[PDB]
Amino acid sequence: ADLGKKLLEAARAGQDDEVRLLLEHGADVNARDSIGSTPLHLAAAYGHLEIVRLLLEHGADVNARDSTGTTPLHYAARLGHLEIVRLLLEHGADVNARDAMGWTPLHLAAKKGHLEIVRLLLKHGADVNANDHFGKTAFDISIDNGNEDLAEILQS
Ligand SMILES: [Mg+2]
Ligand SMILES: [Mg+2]
Ligand SMILES: [Mg+2]
Ligand SMILES: [Mg+2]
Secondary structure, eight states: OOHHHHHHHHHHHTOHHHHHHHHHTTOOTTOOOTTSOOHHHHHHHHTOHHHHHHHHHTTOOTTOOOTTOOOHHHHHHHTTOHHHHHHHHHTTOOTTOOOTTOOOHHHHHHHTTOHHHHHHHHHTTOOTTOOOTTSOOHHHHHHHHTOHHHHHHHTO
């Protein structure tokens, strides 16, 4: 296989030394799979913090979008990986990126009940008044979902 297909595979699987190698030997850091996912997307999704650091150090596009408009920060926020959320934000991730449904990382964290993530996104400039395409804010999702603590952080 092409260096980029391997990198995607390695990233998803958490193979740190294999990702480290591929990058040192010129694999496309932003290689795309069938749905537009990059290595970064996959590492952020599957919780591979070390691979996220490696990728970012080798110039990964921190704000890459897949076919659904989903960024690595959306995945890290949705799936609860607070230390990856922190790292991505420190590397210039777009805190208010909207996916195809209009959801920001904040909306995704609110949907999934991730409080410490909500608190960290709000700390780095998340737009608490952002409406998704359904016309709802992160708060409204909290109410519908039924999350008292999160409903509460969102309205301080
Ligand atoms: Mg991002
Ligand atoms: Mg983003
Ligand atoms: Mg946000
Ligand atoms: Mg927001």
